[PDB]
Amino acid sequence: KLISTMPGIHLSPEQQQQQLQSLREQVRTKNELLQKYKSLCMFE
Amino acid sequence: NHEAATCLEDVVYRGDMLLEKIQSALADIAQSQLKTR
């Protein structure tokens, strides 16, 4: 049972949800910025 | 010399516009990267 307390999770599941949502928003905004500069040419 | 002056002015104007655009773009990238933190 101690060896199955080892795994790798320690935060409350609310904190896991907060981390997952924040990281989802991060990947969204970074992909949106990179797509903006994919589409935008400052020159003609 | 007048004609060469206006020609130099035109090429400087195009370069200035392109520089201001790339400068503002780099500033926006820096703002996004600092806001993500």
């Binding site: 992909n31 990179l34 797509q35 994919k38 040419c41 400052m42 020159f43 | 090429v11 195009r14 392109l18």
Partner: peptide, 19 residues
């Protein structure tokens, strides 16, 4: 000016290849 333009272009040519 030309060099700067093509420089910007190839970096833009790099970025959808990351996307």
């Amino acid at each position: 000016l030309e060099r700067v333009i093509e420089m910007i272009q190839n970096c833009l040519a790099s970025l959808p290849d990351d996307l």
